[PDB]
Design a binder for these strands. Structure first.
Ligand SMILES: [Mn+2]
Ligand SMILES: [Mn+2]
Ligand SMILES: [Mn+2]
Ligand SMILES: [Mn+2]
Ligand SMILES: [Mn+2]
Ligand code: NA
Length: 347
DNA sequence: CGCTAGTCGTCAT
DNA sequence: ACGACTAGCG
């Protein structure tokens, strides 16, 4: 996520209703609904007691989409990405602490604090996601487990023309080059839509409304793949990209101190990290549902060697990627947990 | 003031 | 999976 991006480009946002896409196709960042839904039954998930409330929670939204004539495609997060594994280690750690503290509060008799700790120690397994998958399947609603981050998969579905809008709470989708994104959608269908073409409504952006520059800005501000330099957020990044139409981005980043009129030490490692982050936003492996095969989010340019892009996702055999996408193969154990076959969104 | 860096909140009775 | 909010920084 790009911290403070939505408020930064607020002027490009538009209050809408899902009817806007009546009869069209919309992909969903389902893990948001999964988190928000799992919060409702946090204590049960923490205790280990069986639950299925989040299933219904998601199904409210799914059914609401179906009633308005929308064709939803529930997309799920798959394998851990190396570029993001750092953050995966931190969040997983936090949960652990909150799982202890909470239990520690159950022994001390404190119940409110214990619930406030349980509500911040929730981890969405593939088992839960697969529950949601079966539930949605039993409705004719297609599902698709991304090779890695759902962000990239959604971005692909949107750019390929397979879907017209993306329902999510995450702003990263904009940096991945999505066309239309629907944020903060409630159970009734009311949300904020941000169109890529309307980025020019934001005065603050200036000439930074092109996909490449926008991406560079999002990375420079501080993203999941790379923490920003000290004292740098969206404003300064946007300012840098504004004042500099260089446009070799490396030289600009090396002259960030010059463009911002402030002393900034830029390590050689941060440049390589920036390249890695950029390449991750560009070429993260996704799954083509039609051709049924692993592909990067964008076609490999001439100025990049795919061999050096392991952090952006490792390739596996197309059959395995298919089995993961269908939700048949579990993410962690790599174990066949279901047998679904659509032959007996695709083709 | 503008801006960035951390601590809290998402559910739902 | 994330964002909103704000105290305190320059
Ligand atoms: Mn509750
Ligand atoms: Mn994999
Ligand atoms: Mn995960
Ligand atoms: Mn995501
Ligand atoms: Mn993201
Ligand atoms: Na930052």
């Amino acid at each position: 996520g790009i911290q403070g991006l939505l408020q930064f480009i607020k002027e490009a946002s538009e209050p809408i209703h899902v009817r806007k896409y009546k009869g069209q196709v919309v992909a969903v960042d389902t893990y948001c609904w999964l988190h928000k839904g799992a919060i409702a039954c946090a204590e049960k998930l923490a205790k280990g007691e069986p639950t299925d409330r989040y299933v219904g929670f998601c199904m409210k939204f799914v059914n609401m989409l179906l009633s308005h004539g929308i064709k939803p495609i529930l997309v799920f997060d798959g394998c851990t990405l190396p570029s993001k594994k750092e953050v995966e280690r931190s969040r997983r750690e936090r949960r652990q602490a909150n799982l202890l503290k909470g239990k520690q509060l159950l022994r001390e008799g404190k119940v409110s604090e214990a619930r406030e700790c349980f509500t911040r120690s929730i981890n969405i397994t593939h088992a839960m996601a697969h529950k949601v998958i079966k539930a949605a399947r039993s409705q004719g609603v297609d599902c698709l487990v991304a090779p890695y981050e759902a962000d990239a998969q959604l971005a692909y579905l949107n750019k390929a023309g397979i879907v017209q809008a993306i329902i999510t709470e995450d702003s990263d989708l904009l940096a991945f080059g999505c066309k239309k994104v629907i944020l903060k959608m409630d159970q009734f269908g009311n949300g904020l839509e941000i169109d890529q073409a309307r980025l020019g409504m934001c005065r603050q952006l200036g000439d930074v409304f092109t996909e490449e520059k926008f991406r560079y800005m999002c990375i420079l501000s501080g993203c999941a793949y790379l923490s920003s330099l000290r004292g740098i957020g969206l404003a300064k990044a946007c300012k840098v990209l504004r004042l500099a139409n260089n446009p070799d981005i490396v030289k600009v980043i090396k002259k960030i101190g010059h463009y911002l009129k402030m002393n900034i030490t830029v390590p050689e490692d941060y440049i390589n990290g920036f390249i890695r982050a950029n390449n991750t936003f560009l070429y993260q492996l996704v799954f083509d549902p039609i051709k049924r095969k692993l592909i990067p989010l964008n076609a490999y340019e001439d100025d990049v060697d795919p061999e050096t892009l392991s952090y952006a996702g490792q390739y596996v055999d197309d059959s395995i990627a298919l089995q993961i996408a269908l939700g048949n193969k579990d993410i962690n154990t790599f174990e066949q947990i279901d047998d679904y076959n659509p032959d007996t969104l695709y083709f």
